[PDB]
Amino acid sequence: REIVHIQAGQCGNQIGAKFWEVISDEHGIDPTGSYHGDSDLQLERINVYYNEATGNKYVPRAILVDLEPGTMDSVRSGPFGQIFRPDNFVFGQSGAGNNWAKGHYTEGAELVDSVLDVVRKESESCDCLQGFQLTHSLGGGTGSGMGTLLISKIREEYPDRIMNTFSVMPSPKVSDTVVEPYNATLSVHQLVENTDETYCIDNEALYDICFRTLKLTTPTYGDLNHLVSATMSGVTTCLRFPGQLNADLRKLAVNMVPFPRLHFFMPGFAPLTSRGSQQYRALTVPELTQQMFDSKNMMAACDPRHGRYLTVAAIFRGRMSMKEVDEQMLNVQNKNSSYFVEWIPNNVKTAVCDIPPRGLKMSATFIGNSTAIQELFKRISEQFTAMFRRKAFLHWYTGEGMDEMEFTEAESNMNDLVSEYQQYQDA
Amino acid sequence: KREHEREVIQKAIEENNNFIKMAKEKLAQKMESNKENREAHLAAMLERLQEKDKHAEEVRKNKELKE
Ligand SMILES: Nc1nc2c(ncn2[C@@H]2O[C@H](COP(=O)(O)OP(=O)(O)O)[C@@H](O)[C@H]2O)c(=O)[nH]1
Ligand SMILES: COc1ccc(N(C)c2nc(Cl)nc3ccsc23)cc1
Ligand SMILES: [Mg+2]
């Protein structure tokens, strides 16, 4: 059951590269693609994410995409950059200028067939393709505009495969341009229709965590991406390793999404750690459980107590008592039962994996489908309309052939998404 | 959605082309009327200088008649 990974644009390729660094280390693959590994749990499901090449090398099933060559050069210059298959670098030259319209309609359209050709080659070698995972931001032009263009075309050619994304939401606290709310809103409209699951990675939350919890005065994208790579490693655990669950992307979708459009997840992680500085006391299973459910550990800047959990998936990594894990997980639900919808019985499922992530003896990763995610979309909707009511900065988009009407439809669809999440928060 | 995608890029091509077209026609019309107007002004200037030669001939004629 092979997954095809695609990373698009500046943010997509930077968090994409970190993800492949991190899970390669967990599976015992070095920058050359060779396995110098301790345990054999590391290789049992290694084919979900890695093609095997002659000479027992492991090559990521990864495609790197950008309309601008710069950050893909840095990836190839990067530590594990030599592990990626060079044919799977697909890039243009003109960039996207932080413009969804250029990524989606004019620049990205010129390049998208070359990417689909690379997607096809990787898929035809798959015994049974699960589907795809895309890393991208929603605030730029390439990951957002061309990424959602790729999703739409991938769906046309593979309509029975699962589409999963890790989507980084823009925040004024960590912001490149004023038009991010425009790019994000146009993208969400695409994500609502064309993904089965998207992890909402909120740059607001990543910033708040670094500043407040990790006491990092001036957080860089490097500090943000340490959080992102830890979250990506955790939420993938049950796809990559053998366990009592043996999950795949479709089963995750079936068990997490009660209504098709409500497929946007708040990820959570514990313990929260900053890069480089290690702390030497492991948590207790009781500590892991409380931190993973704490709003201060959510990667989407929403208060869970402002909504209800439709479904939750939790994964505990490290050598620990599964009895204690079970008791602590039962404890949080029984003590906080009002925050779990009563009409989905037993909507919390826990998995355990023996292999911990690098640098931690124990970790807990949280995947929540909460109606509180609507706060994220409301925040973006306010920033959109603040400019849109004066049609501010629109010429960047009408200059690529876009119409105001398209902005009105995307805003209206995202408002409907907020309404639907509100509908189930009271039931 | 594919239909709408190529209509967007065709629209972008059509606006950019139309802008190029109107700029080219605008200055072609501007340079044409500028050339006419300047020539009309120079033509009027010569036409009045030439009238000064017509008048100067008449002046000498009247002097001859006075003999
Ligand atoms: N967390 C994180 N966010 C990023 C990173 N790079 C860019 N972003 C976000 O992505 C947005 C810029 O879009 P970008 O991906 O650079 O444009 P693109 O090159 O067209 O894909 C900004 O709002 C940033 O907040 C990164 O390394 N980490
Ligand atoms: C709400 O009930 C459920 C929620 C999710 C699942 N499935 C399929 C998972 N898939 C992956 Cl990939 N990881 C995890 C980790 C914990 S559950 C889980 C199963 C039941
Ligand atoms: Mg950028």
UniProtKB/TrEMBL annotation, chain A:
Pfam family name, one: Tubulin
Main location per the UniProt record: cytoplasm
Swiss-Prot/TrEMBL cofactor(s): Mg(2+)
Gene Ontology biological process terms, A to Z: microtubule-based process
GO molecular function terms attached to this record: GTP binding; GTPase activity; metal ion binding; structural constituent of cytoskeleton
Gene Ontology CC, one term: microtubule
Signal peptide: none
CDD domains documented for this protein: beta_tubulin (cd02187)
Keyword Nucleotide-binding in record: yes
PANTHER family given in the database record: TUBULIN
Protein name: Tubulin beta chain
